[PDB]
Enzyme design. Structure first.
Site, PDB file in Angstrom:
ATOM      1  CG  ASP A   8     -14.902  -3.058  -4.918  1.00  0.00           C
ATOM      2  OD1 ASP A   8     -14.434  -2.248  -4.080  1.00  0.00           O
ATOM      3  OD2 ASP A   8     -14.854  -2.875  -6.157  1.00  0.00           O
ATOM      4  CD  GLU A  67     -11.986  -0.928   0.581  1.00  0.00           C
ATOM      5  OE1 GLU A  67     -12.185  -0.232  -0.433  1.00  0.00           O
ATOM      6  OE2 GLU A  67     -11.085  -1.797   0.657  1.00  0.00           O
ATOM      7  CG  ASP A 142     -10.281  -3.885  -5.407  1.00  0.00           C
ATOM      8  OD1 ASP A 142      -9.099  -4.215  -5.149  1.00  0.00           O
ATOM      9  OD2 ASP A 142     -10.586  -2.819  -6.010  1.00  0.00           O
TER      10      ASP A 142
END
Lengths: 153, 153
Positions: A8, A67, A142
């Site tokens: 992340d 991500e 995350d």
């Protein structure tokens, strides 16, 4: 069967999470934060690169999950975030990891069950799926969520 | 005497330029373009990392010179520029180069003599100071400009 690293990235903190796929699901391997708040910009980037490499070498993940960036808050945030993301990605690829990219919505759908889940749901389901007692820091949580999103695909 | 690497990062094209600090000024060593157009992002970032490292191993610069980003054109632009920029900087540092950052205005002051020089004057002074016969590609001459800025300074 497959150890997975989730990253992340951030301007000042890059979270990381390593999970191991089991037939039962996923086991926690490691997580934490790489903090890059102080120093010349280049030293901050190289710490990210070196720390990701050392997480990989220590725990042997063969797959990187990241991500997709959708909306950064502004161009300055996007630039600093991008620099840390790039430094983390090439560290994974130097170690020979495959790389999968998931949107924020895919991550929340796999971990919580719906693409619109809020942060509390994500953190709780990360601790549920990985059987954690200790609330992990949000960047490590995350990163764990992103790693779990890649598991069992 | 120092061999100096200048880098002009970009999502699609990263210019590089290497110059050698002589006592009489600066000598041309190499320049060119690192093209990362087609492919998934992570393969594009890894090309930048590996290509920058290859330039350094080939021509032996011990110093990296880079230009500060003040205003990116927008946040989509900034994200992709930062990713290439981080990939290039950590490659340089894995090779043990020192890193020096200059503003766009410092780069133009050192090369043309004034901070507000346009792209035309910069490219001609790059060719004049390095006694080049051929116009370098724009990303290459910006990279050479950035390298010249670090020389002796």
């Amino acid at each position: 069967m497959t150890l997975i690293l989730g990253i992340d990235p951030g301007s000042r903190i890059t979270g990381f999470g390593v999970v191991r796929e089991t037939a039962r699901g996923c086991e926690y391997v490691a997580s934490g934060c790489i903090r890059t708040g102080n120093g010349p910009l280049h030293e901050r980037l190289h710490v990210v690169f070196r720390s990701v490499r050392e997480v990989i070498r220590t725990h042997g993940p063969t797959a990187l999950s990241i991500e997709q960036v959708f909306m950064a808050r502004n161009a300055d945030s996007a630039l600093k975030l991008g620099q840390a993301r790039g430094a983390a990605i090439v560290a994974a690829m130097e170690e020979g990891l495959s790389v999968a990219e998931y949107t924020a919505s895919q991550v929340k759908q796999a971990v919580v069950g719906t693409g619109g889940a809020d942060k509390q749901q994500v953190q709780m389901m990360v601790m549920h799926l990985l059987k954690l007692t200790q609330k992990p820091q949000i960047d490590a949580s995350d990163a764990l969520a992103i790693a779990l999103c890649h598991a069992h695909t």
